[PDB]
Each structure stands twice: as C-alpha cells, then as structure tokens.
Design an enzyme around this catalytic site. Structure first.
Site, PDB file in Angstrom:
ATOM      1  N   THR A  34       0.802  -1.210   0.000  1.00  0.00           N
ATOM      2  CA  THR A  34       0.000   0.000   0.000  1.00  0.00           C
ATOM      3  C   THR A  34       0.848   1.279   0.000  1.00  0.00           C
ATOM      4  O   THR A  34       0.418   2.310  -0.516  1.00  0.00           O
ATOM      5  CB  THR A  34      -0.943   0.012   1.213  1.00  0.00           C
ATOM      6  OG1 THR A  34      -0.229  -0.428   2.370  1.00  0.00           O
ATOM      7  CG2 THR A  34      -2.118  -0.931   0.978  1.00  0.00           C
ATOM      8  N   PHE A  63      -6.425   4.807   6.820  1.00  0.00           N
ATOM      9  CA  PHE A  63      -5.723   3.859   7.696  1.00  0.00           C
ATOM     10  C   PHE A  63      -6.694   3.125   8.624  1.00  0.00           C
ATOM     11  O   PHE A  63      -6.309   2.624   9.676  1.00  0.00           O
ATOM     12  CB  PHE A  63      -4.639   4.573   8.494  1.00  0.00           C
ATOM     13  CG  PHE A  63      -3.539   5.146   7.638  1.00  0.00           C
ATOM     14  CD1 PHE A  63      -2.585   4.314   7.056  1.00  0.00           C
ATOM     15  CD2 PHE A  63      -3.448   6.509   7.424  1.00  0.00           C
ATOM     16  CE1 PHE A  63      -1.566   4.845   6.270  1.00  0.00           C
ATOM     17  CE2 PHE A  63      -2.440   7.045   6.642  1.00  0.00           C
ATOM     18  CZ  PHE A  63      -1.494   6.218   6.065  1.00  0.00           C
ATOM     19  N   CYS A  92      -4.543   1.054  11.192  1.00  0.00           N
ATOM     20  CA  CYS A  92      -3.211   0.702  10.756  1.00  0.00           C
ATOM     21  C   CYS A  92      -2.132   0.945  11.820  1.00  0.00           C
ATOM     22  O   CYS A  92      -1.919   2.070  12.267  1.00  0.00           O
ATOM     23  CB  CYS A  92      -2.877   1.520   9.527  1.00  0.00           C
ATOM     24  SG  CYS A  92      -1.259   1.135   8.862  1.00  0.00           S
TER      25      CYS A  92
HETATM   26  O1  LIG Z   1     -14.310  -9.526   0.177  1.00  0.00           O
HETATM   27  C1  LIG Z   1     -15.397  -8.926   0.356  1.00  0.00           C
HETATM   28  O2  LIG Z   1     -16.264  -9.245   1.194  1.00  0.00           O
HETATM   29  C2  LIG Z   1     -15.662  -7.687  -0.511  1.00  0.00           C
HETATM   30  C3  LIG Z   1     -16.312  -8.074  -1.827  1.00  0.00           C
HETATM   31  C4  LIG Z   1     -17.614  -8.831  -1.484  1.00  0.00           C
HETATM   32  C5  LIG Z   1     -18.682  -8.267  -0.924  1.00  0.00           C
HETATM   33  N1  LIG Z   1     -19.608  -9.215  -0.780  1.00  0.00           N
HETATM   34  C6  LIG Z   1     -19.111 -10.357  -1.256  1.00  0.00           C
HETATM   35  C7  LIG Z   1     -19.657 -11.577  -1.334  1.00  0.00           C
HETATM   36  C8  LIG Z   1     -18.933 -12.634  -1.879  1.00  0.00           C
HETATM   37  C9  LIG Z   1     -17.646 -12.390  -2.339  1.00  0.00           C
HETATM   38  C10 LIG Z   1     -17.130 -11.101  -2.234  1.00  0.00           C
HETATM   39  C11 LIG Z   1     -17.863 -10.122  -1.699  1.00  0.00           C
HETATM   40  N2  LIG Z   1     -14.341  -7.089  -0.790  1.00  0.00           N
HETATM   41  C12 LIG Z   1     -14.150  -5.796  -1.116  1.00  0.00           C
HETATM   42  O3  LIG Z   1     -15.068  -4.982  -1.237  1.00  0.00           O
HETATM   43  C13 LIG Z   1     -12.673  -5.376  -1.340  1.00  0.00           C
HETATM   44  F1  LIG Z   1     -12.665  -4.084  -1.669  1.00  0.00           F
HETATM   45  F2  LIG Z   1     -12.205  -6.086  -2.369  1.00  0.00           F
HETATM   46  C14 LIG Z   1     -11.827  -5.621  -0.048  1.00  0.00           C
HETATM   47  F3  LIG Z   1     -11.847  -6.925  -0.167  1.00  0.00           F
HETATM   48  F4  LIG Z   1     -12.751  -5.013   0.716  1.00  0.00           F
HETATM   49  C15 LIG Z   1     -10.487  -4.914  -0.333  1.00  0.00           C
HETATM   50  F5  LIG Z   1     -10.611  -3.597  -0.204  1.00  0.00           F
HETATM   51  F6  LIG Z   1     -10.058  -5.192  -1.560  1.00  0.00           F
HETATM   52  C16 LIG Z   1      -9.452  -5.444   0.690  1.00  0.00           C
HETATM   53  F7  LIG Z   1      -9.126  -6.682   0.320  1.00  0.00           F
HETATM   54  F8  LIG Z   1     -10.027  -5.489   1.893  1.00  0.00           F
HETATM   55  C17 LIG Z   1      -8.163  -4.589   0.799  1.00  0.00           C
HETATM   56  F9  LIG Z   1      -8.439  -3.470   1.471  1.00  0.00           F
HETATM   57  F10 LIG Z   1      -7.739  -4.257  -0.415  1.00  0.00           F
HETATM   58  C18 LIG Z   1      -7.036  -5.398   1.498  1.00  0.00           C
HETATM   59  F11 LIG Z   1      -6.584  -6.300   0.627  1.00  0.00           F
HETATM   60  F12 LIG Z   1      -7.580  -6.056   2.524  1.00  0.00           F
HETATM   61  C19 LIG Z   1      -5.868  -4.497   2.015  1.00  0.00           C
HETATM   62  F13 LIG Z   1      -6.363  -4.332   3.209  1.00  0.00           F
HETATM   63  F14 LIG Z   1      -6.016  -3.547   1.136  1.00  0.00           F
HETATM   64  C20 LIG Z   1      -4.588  -5.332   1.860  1.00  0.00           C
HETATM   65  F15 LIG Z   1      -3.597  -4.508   2.182  1.00  0.00           F
HETATM   66  F16 LIG Z   1      -4.420  -5.695   0.595  1.00  0.00           F
HETATM   67  C21 LIG Z   1      -4.460  -6.598   2.731  1.00  0.00           C
HETATM   68  F17 LIG Z   1      -4.992  -7.630   2.079  1.00  0.00           F
HETATM   69  F18 LIG Z   1      -5.114  -6.430   3.869  1.00  0.00           F
HETATM   70  C22 LIG Z   1      -2.971  -6.890   3.028  1.00  0.00           C
HETATM   71  F19 LIG Z   1      -2.488  -5.915   3.790  1.00  0.00           F
HETATM   72  F20 LIG Z   1      -2.301  -6.907   1.877  1.00  0.00           F
HETATM   73  C23 LIG Z   1      -2.751  -8.233   3.752  1.00  0.00           C
HETATM   74  F21 LIG Z   1      -3.507  -8.059   4.808  1.00  0.00           F
HETATM   75  F22 LIG Z   1      -1.457  -8.174   3.942  1.00  0.00           F
HETATM   76  F23 LIG Z   1      -3.169  -9.049   2.817  1.00  0.00           F
HETATM   77  C1  HEM Z   2      -0.166   3.983   2.664  1.00  0.00           C
HETATM   78  C2  HEM Z   2       0.149   2.959   3.457  1.00  0.00           C
HETATM   79  C3  HEM Z   2      -0.833   2.151   4.219  1.00  0.00           C
HETATM   80  C4  HEM Z   2      -2.196   2.120   4.147  1.00  0.00           C
HETATM   81  C5  HEM Z   2      -3.062   2.913   3.191  1.00  0.00           C
HETATM   82  C6  HEM Z   2      -2.645   1.191   5.134  1.00  0.00           C
HETATM   83  C7  HEM Z   2      -4.006   0.920   5.378  1.00  0.00           C
HETATM   84  C8  HEM Z   2      -4.458   0.101   6.402  1.00  0.00           C
HETATM   85  C9  HEM Z   2      -5.826  -0.125   6.675  1.00  0.00           C
HETATM   86  C10 HEM Z   2      -6.977   0.495   5.919  1.00  0.00           C
HETATM   87  C11 HEM Z   2      -5.897  -0.981   7.730  1.00  0.00           C
HETATM   88  C12 HEM Z   2      -7.181  -1.487   8.372  1.00  0.00           C
HETATM   89  C13 HEM Z   2      -7.669  -2.752   7.657  1.00  0.00           C
HETATM   90  C14 HEM Z   2      -9.016  -3.247   8.148  1.00  0.00           C
HETATM   91  O1  HEM Z   2      -9.717  -2.628   8.988  1.00  0.00           O
HETATM   92  O2  HEM Z   2      -9.436  -4.342   7.686  1.00  0.00           O
HETATM   93  C15 HEM Z   2      -4.564  -1.285   8.124  1.00  0.00           C
HETATM   94  C16 HEM Z   2      -4.219  -2.165   9.120  1.00  0.00           C
HETATM   95  C17 HEM Z   2      -2.885  -2.551   9.303  1.00  0.00           C
HETATM   96  N1  HEM Z   2      -1.769  -2.036   8.709  1.00  0.00           N
HETATM   97 FE1  HEM Z   2      -1.680  -0.691   7.339  1.00  0.00          FE
HETATM   98  N2  HEM Z   2      -1.585   0.723   5.813  1.00  0.00           N
HETATM   99  C18 HEM Z   2      -0.449   1.219   5.304  1.00  0.00           C
HETATM  100  C19 HEM Z   2       0.868   0.957   5.684  1.00  0.00           C
HETATM  101  C20 HEM Z   2       1.245  -0.018   6.597  1.00  0.00           C
HETATM  102  C21 HEM Z   2       2.566  -0.324   6.971  1.00  0.00           C
HETATM  103  C22 HEM Z   2       3.807   0.382   6.455  1.00  0.00           C
HETATM  104  C23 HEM Z   2       2.496  -1.369   7.897  1.00  0.00           C
HETATM  105  C24 HEM Z   2       3.593  -2.047   8.636  1.00  0.00           C
HETATM  106  C25 HEM Z   2       4.862  -1.650   8.647  1.00  0.00           C
HETATM  107  C26 HEM Z   2       1.121  -1.703   8.061  1.00  0.00           C
HETATM  108  C27 HEM Z   2       0.616  -2.665   8.907  1.00  0.00           C
HETATM  109  C28 HEM Z   2      -0.744  -2.788   9.185  1.00  0.00           C
HETATM  110  C29 HEM Z   2      -1.209  -3.775  10.177  1.00  0.00           C
HETATM  111  C30 HEM Z   2      -0.394  -4.772  10.966  1.00  0.00           C
HETATM  112  C31 HEM Z   2      -2.546  -3.639  10.238  1.00  0.00           C
HETATM  113  C32 HEM Z   2      -3.481  -4.429  11.137  1.00  0.00           C
HETATM  114  C33 HEM Z   2      -3.624  -3.684  12.476  1.00  0.00           C
HETATM  115  C34 HEM Z   2      -4.497  -4.431  13.460  1.00  0.00           C
HETATM  116  O3  HEM Z   2      -5.672  -4.718  13.143  1.00  0.00           O
HETATM  117  O4  HEM Z   2      -4.065  -4.748  14.594  1.00  0.00           O
HETATM  118  N3  HEM Z   2       0.397  -0.823   7.302  1.00  0.00           N
HETATM  119  N4  HEM Z   2      -3.683  -0.605   7.309  1.00  0.00           N
END
Ligand SMILES: O=C(O)[C@H](Cc1c[nH]c2ccccc12)NC(=O)C(F)(F)C(F)(F)C(F)(F)C(F)(F)C(F)(F)C(F)(F)C(F)(F)C(F)(F)C(F)(F)C(F)(F)C(F)(F)F
Ligand code: HEM
Ligand SMILES: O=C(O)[C@H](Cc1c[nH]c2ccccc12)NC(=O)C(F)(F)C(F)(F)C(F)(F)C(F)(F)C(F)(F)C(F)(F)C(F)(F)C(F)(F)C(F)(F)C(F)(F)C(F)(F)F
Ligand code: HEM
Lengths: 452, 452
Positions: A265, A390, A397
C-alpha cells in the site's frame, strides 16, 4: 428500502465482482445509488457505506467491530492470526497489538530512519545513473523501495530489489496469491477438481513466502549484531496484559503480514502521489520548493522529514483520492439502527468504501475530484471519520507513521534531486490486486545534480 | 615431418574443434605432440606453436605480421576494420592506432580512475548488502563490473549492470555472436539450410549491438557536458601521419570493438585471479595484507593502485596460467625457415597457443601448473617473448594498461573489504567463447566492515 444494484437471478449481485476492477465498479455503483447499498451473493449479504453521515456510526467501536471480509478470510490462508487477519477477540490479536505497538513508538521511528535513508539513496542513485532518454517505471521502483525498506528496517533483511530488473520472487508470489484471492471472491464450488492446480499454485506461492520468512528467522537466530527492530520485539517482547510473548507460529504469520502490509500500500501511495504531482505542476513546484528549502543536507534527518509539511499534505491528498487499501469490513456487535433508518441485527456486516467516503461532497465541497493538498493545511479541520485511509480505532493501521515517514522522506528526496516529466501524457489506469496501484505509469527524471 | 593430430578422413583435423572447449583440446594436443603441430581443415592449414624458442621467432615483426584467424574473420562481420579485426596494412589500422593510443596514456589512466572507482564501489556495495549464507556468482559479477567500466570510462554510458539479475542484453547478444563464431569454426557445409536460424539470430544479435552503439553516439552529440574520453578521441582526434580523423563507419566498428575487447577478457582475468586466490590461501593472505597496508583511504587513488605490486603479480600469474585471449595468429611475410627446421612459404599461417607457451618448462621450470605470483617479483628475469598474454609488437593489446589498472584496483578493493571462502570446493570448469572464463565459480564473502 435499501438501494441495491442490478441482479443476475440466483447469483444475485455476485457477477458485479467478476471484473478486473471490482473496487472501481463498486465506486460507480455508489455514484448511482448513494450513501448505502445492499450487496448480495448466494448465502451472504453486506451493505456498502459511502457517506461520512453513516460511516461515523460504523466507526463507533461500541456498536461495530472489525469483520474479516471474504478477501481477508482467503488471505488468512497464508497470513493466519497475524494482526491484519485476526479477529479482535482472538487472544493473539491483543497480545500482538500490545507487543508490537512499541515498534512504532517515536523512539522506534527515529531508529528506523537511517535504514529508510539507505534504501532511498539506492533509489536516488538508480535514477541519477539513468542514461539520456531513459524513463522510470514508477510503481515497479516504488515497490522495490517499499519492500526493501520494510525488510531492512523491520527484519534486518535485504531483499536487494534494486539489484534485479524483475520483481523479487517474494513479490511475484505475493501478487499471484493476492489476485487469486481477488478471483476466489467471484467463484462457486471451490472443491471442484478444476481448481486443483489453482490450489497447487496457491500453495506453491505460499511456500515461497514462508521459505523467505524461514530465512529471516534463521538469519536473526545465527546473528550477533544487536538488532533492536520489529523482529526483536516479535521474538522477545512480552504483552503487559497477559505477561506472555508471541509463540513461533504467530511470529511467522506476523512476518508475512508485515512484509505484505508493510510495503504494498505504501508503493501505491508513492505511485499515486507522483502521478498527481506530474499532473499538477504548480503543486509539484510548491512541493519541490519545500524540499529544497528544508532538505539542506546530503542525508535527510528525522527532524527534516517531520518539517516537510507540504509533502505531507500531498500524501494525504493522494490518500484522499486513491486510498490504496480501499475498503474495510465491520460487523454489528449488537442489534442497532444505522442512520435512524436501517435496522441491523447482531452480526450484520458493513463495508466502508473509502474512496467514496473521500468524495462525500457534504464534507469536501463540490470539487472532490481535484487534487488540492491545501485541504490538509490543518488536518484538525477534517471532521471525525471523514478521512479514513488507515482504517478505524483499535483496528487502525499499526504502521501509519512508518508508511508516512518513509513516503515523506522518499518523495522529499525525489523532489530535491530531480525534475519530472509526464513524457507520455499518461492516462491513469488503476490495477486492482485487492489494493490499488497505477499500472504502466512512467516518467522521465532530469537530475538537478545535487550530490548525496 | 611435422607432427599432426588425429584426422577424420576428408574433414582432416576440423572435427577436433567440434567441442565446447577447443582451446583446451588444442592444449592437450600440444602436450602430446610438442612445440609445433600442423592442423588442417578442408582448404586451409595452420601450424600451432607452443615453445618460447619458436614463438620468439614468430614475434619477429620483420618476418611475421598479424593474421586474422578464421575466428577473427567471422568476428569481423560485426567488428569490421576496427583495431582488433583489421590487417596491419589497411589504412584504418595505423590511423585508428595513432588516434587512440593517447587514450591509453598515463595521463588518460589518471583521467579514467574516478569512473573505475564508481563501478568498483557498486561491486563492493553489492557484496556488502548480501544476506547471511548468500554467495557470489563470480564471472557474472566480474562481467557486470568490466562492461560497466569500459562503458562509463570509454563512452560515458551506463550499462547499469548491477541493476539487473540477468545480463545486459548487449552481453546476451555478444556471447551468442562469439560462441556462434566458435561453433562456426567446426562446421562442415556451413550453408546447410539447418543453419539458417543460426544465421538469422546472428544478424539479430548484431542489430542489438549496433543499436546500442547508435545510442552511445546519439547521447554524446546531444550531451552538453564536457567529456574527454575514448569517444571524444574517436570523434575529434586526427591521425598525425595522415592528418585524417576516423570516418563514421569506422567509429562504429571501434565502439563495438572496445565494448567487447574492453571488458570480456578482463572479466575472465578477475575471475581466474579470484579462483587462484581462494585455491591458494597463503597467496590470498599476502595479497590481502598488501591491500590493507596500501589502500588506506575509503576512495583508492591512482597512486595507491600503482603501489599494489603483489596484486599485480597475482594478476600476471593468473594470465600466465589462463590467458583469457588464449591465441593469436601470424602469417609469414616472405619465405622463411622457422627454428632452423621448418620451411615456411610466404603467406603460411602460425597460431601462438599462449597457455602452452606459458607452460614451457625450459623457461619456467618443471612446476608450471603451480600458482606462484613470486615468478613475477623481479620482472626482468622473464625471458624475451616468454610471457605474451597481451599479444605482440605493434599489434599488441592497446588496452593492457587499462585492463591492469582496472583489475588491480578492483581486486585490491575486494581484498581490502572481504574475506573469501571457496564454500563449494569448486572444481575448475573453463567455458570457452573464443575467450576463456571459469563457469559456475561461486564464493562466499565475509565483510571486514571497512567503510567506503
Ligand atoms: O471480500 C469482500 O467481502 C468484498 C467483496 C464482497 C462483498 N460481498 C461479497 C460476497 C462474496 C464475495 C465477495 C464479496 N471485498 C471488497 O469490497 C474489497 F474491496 F475487495 C476488499 F476486499 F474489501 C479490499 F478492499 F479489496 C481489501 F481486500 F479489503 C483490501 F483493502 F484491499 C485489502 F486487501 F484487505 C488491504 F487491506 F487492502 C490489503 F492490504 F491488501 C491486505 F490484504 F489487507 C494486506 F495488507 F495486503 C494483507 F492483509 F497483507 F493481505
Ligand atoms: C499507505 C500505506 C498504508 C495504508 C493505506 C494502510 C491501510 C491500512 C488499513 C486500511 C488498515 C485497516 C484494515 C481493516 O480494517 O481491515 C490497516 C491495518 C494494518 N496495517 Fe496498514 N496501511 C499502510 C501501511 C502499513 C505499513 C507500512 C504497515 C507495517 C509496517 C502496516 C501494517 C498494518 C497492520 C499490521 C494492520 C493491522 C492492524 C491491526 O488490526 O491490529 N500498514 N492498514
Ligand atoms: O580460428 C582459427 O583459425 C583457429 C581454429 C582453426 C585453426 N584452423 C582452422 C581451420 C578451420 C576452422 C578453424 C580453425 N582458432 C583458434 O585456435 C582459437 F584459439 F580458437 C582462436 F581463434 F585463436 C581464439 F583463441 F579463439 C582467438 F581467436 F584468438 C580469440 F579467442 F578469439 C582471441 F582472438 F584470442 C580473442 F581475443 F579472445 C577474441 F575472442 F578474438 C576477442 F578478443 F574476444 C575478440 F573477439 F576478438 C574481441 F573481443 F572482439 F576482441
Ligand atoms: C586481461 C585483459 C586483456 C587481454 C588478456 C587482452 C589480450 C589481447 C591480445 C592477446 C591482443 C592481440 C590479439 C591478436 O594478435 O590477434 C589484444 C589486442 C587488443 N586489445 Fe586487448 N586484452 C585485454 C584487455 C583489453 C582492453 C581492456 C581493451 C580496451 C579497453 C582491449 C583492446 C584491445 C584492442 C583494440 C586490441 C587490438 C590492438 C591492435 O591490433 O591495434 N584489450 N588484446
């Protein structure tokens, strides 16, 4: 009655996600239907929220807690009960939360700064060394930087991404696993033998990621260099509440989690920021002037990065328009009424559609598509729950300050050392891999010939 | 009657070269047959010389002149009348020789030094940045270094080889062209339709090399910076004898020539030198001690590199055993008798087999296979024409001082900054691409943690 987008008989709304750009599709649906719409698939339902009016209720932690969306449940196949994919009520969530928050203290951040500079200097040197007429592949180089930064700062491990013309194998496997999760969303009969190879490939990519985690842990094990970094806290930190450390299984999940969450991200953010800068030359000039005024030494200091106020505003405005983790999920802790209009039962799910929240004209004014860093002149002026790149509350985050410090440092150095050209007049094309990133974004740099 | 190796009917000795390792095969033939043997193919003959007593005569420029071997004639398809592939009597030979000789003066070497350090520092940083238990691919990294050094020092062009995990495309095409020429030696009926694909790729590989040359030239004319490098002399220098500068066609041939000749054999030298060092730990100790005693500054100076006597002795002893351009060809200017025994007619060809010359027991003693740099401690002690890794007379290597300065600097820095381990107990395997290089040679480095 709750608005709902177009349906496909027994598949309900599910086919709307059978696209390479599902978030962008949902944004268009939100534009058509407004602040709330129901989204159904066979056997499930969620409600997509797009207004600050409703999202401020969703962010009330007494009423709603973090839900694992379908995407996160599939990511949990490799991320386990790491921080991002754990439920708030799992013992390992609060333990890891308490144990790892100290790794993002002010003193920790000051401690990471030198290693952030190490990687930023590698980026700057790469671009200084380009020949005439050569260009930069922006998201690719931003991914090199961010992966290397989390690896080095976090784990004293060098991915050495700037020594490769291809992505590091970790990245290739991560990307393939992430969009395989973006694929599993729109599917049926997952136990079909047709997907036996998809599972084989998924397990292969997971093994690649775990093999690298193996190396990181073994290297620390054999080392005697006195590290005090994120991995140090994983291996030695005790939760004040339970008095317990993390066990080895959870530690492995946290490493995978932080390697992915800790760079992907941020590479998106830097890519979008540079995109908006080259598309808004007066903004670029203002940011460049700040970089030149503030970054008066060949090595930027921690304090100097903190003084890059306008660069910080640029980053916030990029996160407003294209938050690179574009949604998060919540469930109702108890029966409750949303918006005085929509009764929900305990367990009912919500999705916060962050890019749409960030275009709420009742908050931001009519010009929501314009790139104006000046919206963030005083971050205090933004209403509660209006700007949520975040996430929210105790599940927000953990790495926010790390990401912003890194991005501010790097963008500052970029603007100090080069002028940039949008030589192709690039047309924004946002690739989705759950996260968002410009695809094919390229620029040319011309060195200002300032030494490091 | 002159000795001759085994024959294959009408193909005569030609199939003896149908091997991936033709020079090493010729060395074995020389061991069996002695100081001179005849080698015949359909419609051509040459005589391979292996003794100092016969080679000293061959090096009499009043009796013998440089010949283009069949290999050099095929290389001429892309190197044209550049310095390496021109006949002595072609106008463009002495013209280019006179124009470019000053580009290899001590004044010139002092000028290149800073840029040689630029690339050497990239090498050292790469190795400093390796993780625990990672290894170094020696010939690969030496090729990265030497290509980049001639590119930058010679042409102010950055191949940026350390930013790639695969070879620069130029290298990929160069190697394919070279080994094609090696493989084209052993071909009977070369116009067979099977070899049409090989001809098509050869022309594609030439096009890659020429496009890169065209970019180097285009960059220079567009550039507004003051360079006074090899390219400057190619473009602006006048031959004192004719009063003429090089024409455009010849300049292109010289750039191709210098990019190839200016790095390949130096990469081999560095690779063989490091091989012999790790196989002779007392020699490694002596060289490392010198490097530590002499290279007292983070940035080595030209004067300090000149001070590395023992490192120079190491390189010469590596050149004794494995001269990386392992042969050169001569023709008889008139009828003459070689060694009081072998009558030659005008035009008759000789091949000097340098690795065998360097194993002449009558010169070096019986222990010729042992690696002993101390053979070169009192350099006047080496008999005339006994040591010829850089060829002979006016057709000797124009780049000898460049190669040795680069190799001495780089090997010096390598020995200053790291301890080395032959962790695989590597078995020498010499790959032939006309030139010689170890293949699959890997080591581990342990940093001495001395800052740059
Ligand atoms: O998965 C869901 O429930 C619904 C789509 C949905 C809605 N209803 C449904 C019914 C059946 C199937 C699917 C659906 N998903 C979304 O709207 C979505 F936007 F794709 C998401 F899944 F919300 C999302 F935004 F892509 C996401 F996956 F949450 C996310 F934000 F991109 C995210 F991948 F989680 C992240 F948070 F962005 C992430 F960083 F990529 C991450 F996956 F969390 C990550 F940090 F990479 C990881 F956690 F490391 F993987
Ligand atoms: C632009 C940069 C970033 C964005 C936009 C971002 C966004 C987010 C968001 C939206 C969540 C909440 C997810 C949810 O509620 O499902 C989250 C959680 C988290 N992020 Fe990030 N993030 C960023 C960078 C980082 C970095 C640099 C790290 C680690 C070094 C990190 C580690 C995490 C972790 C561990 C969580 C889970 C926290 C918990 O639930 O305890 N993120 N982030
Ligand atoms: O080509 C020949 O006439 C004979 C083999 C031969 C003998 N009789 C024959 C009859 C028919 C066919 C072949 C033969 N060649 C060899 O014995 C030989 F050793 F392979 C060789 F060709 F001399 C050689 F060593 F490879 C070589 F040509 F000298 C050489 F290696 F190419 C070299 F010249 F030494 C060289 F310098 F390394 C090089 F490869 F030419 C080179 F420098 F890399 C280069 F390619 F010229 C340059 F890089 F462009 F400069
Ligand atoms: C260890 C390194 C090197 C070795 C062993 C080597 C060896 C040789 C040999 C044996 C020849 C004579 C070939 C013949 O008679 O057919 C030669 C010629 C030549 N070398 Fe090198 N060389 C080295 C490095 C370089 C470098 C670094 C350059 C350029 C920067 C270079 C440029 C040339 C040129 C142009 C000729 C042709 C000279 C002429 O005939 O006018 N060499 N070299």
């Amino acid at each position: 009655e709750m608005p709902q987008p177009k349906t496909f008989g027994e598949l309900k709304n599910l086919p709307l996600l059978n696209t390479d750009k599902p978030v962008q599709a949902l944004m268009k649906i939100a534009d058509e239907l407004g602040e709330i719409f129901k989204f159904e698939a066979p056997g499930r339902v969620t409600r997509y929220l797009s207004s600050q009016r409703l999202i401020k209720e969703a962010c009330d932690e007494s009423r709603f807690d973090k839900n694992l969306s379908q995407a996160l449940k599939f990511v949990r196949d490799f991320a386990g009960d790491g921080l991002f994919t754990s439920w708030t009520h799992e013992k390992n969530w609060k333990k890891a939360h308490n144990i790892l928050l100290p790794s993002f203290s002010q003193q920790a951040m000051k401690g990471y700064h030198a290693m952030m500079v190490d990687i930023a200097v590698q980026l700057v040197q790469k671009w200084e060394r380009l020949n005439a007429d050569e260009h930069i592949e922006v998201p690719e180089d931003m991914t090199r930087l961010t992966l290397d930064t989390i690896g080095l700062c976090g784990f004293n491990y060098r991915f050495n991404s700037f020594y490769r013309d291809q992505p590091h194998p970790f990245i290739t496997s991560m990307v393939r696993a992430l969009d395989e999760a973006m694929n599993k969303l729109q599917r049926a009969n997952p136990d079909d033998p047709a997907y036996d190879e998809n599972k084989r490939q998924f397990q292969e990519d997971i093994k690649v990621m775990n093999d690298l985690v193996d190396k990181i842990i073994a290297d620390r094990k054999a080392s005697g260099e006195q590290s005090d970094d994120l991995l140090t806290h994983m291996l030695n930190g005790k939760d004040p509440e339970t008095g317990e450390p993390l066990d080895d299984e959870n530690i492995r999940y946290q490493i995978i989690t932080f390697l992915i969450a800790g760079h992907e991200t941020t590479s998106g953010l830097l890519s979008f920021a540079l995109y908006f800068l080259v598309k808004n030359p007066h903004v670029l000039q203002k940011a460049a002037e700040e970089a030149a005024r503030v970054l008066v030494d060949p090595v930027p200091s921690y304090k100097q990065v903190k003084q890059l106020k306008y660069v910080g505003m640029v980053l916030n405005e990029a996160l407003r328009l294209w938050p690179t983790a574009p949604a998060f999920s919540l469930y109702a802790k108890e029966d409750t009424v949303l918006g005085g209009e929509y009764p929900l039962e305990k367990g009912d799910e919500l999705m916060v559609l962050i890019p749409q929240l960030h275009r709420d004209k009742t908050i931001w004014g009519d010009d929501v598509e314009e790139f104006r860093p000046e919206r963030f002149e005083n971050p205090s002026a933004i209403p509660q729950h209006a700007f949520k790149p975040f996430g929210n509350g105790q599940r927000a985050c953990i790495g926010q300050q790390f990401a912003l410090h890194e991005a501010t440092l790097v963008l500052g150095m970029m603007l100090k050392h080069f002028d940039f050209e949008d030589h192709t007049n690039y047309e924004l094309d946002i690739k989705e891999t759950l996260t968002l990133k410009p695809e094919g974004f390229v620029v040319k740099a011309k060195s200002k010939k300032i030494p490091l």
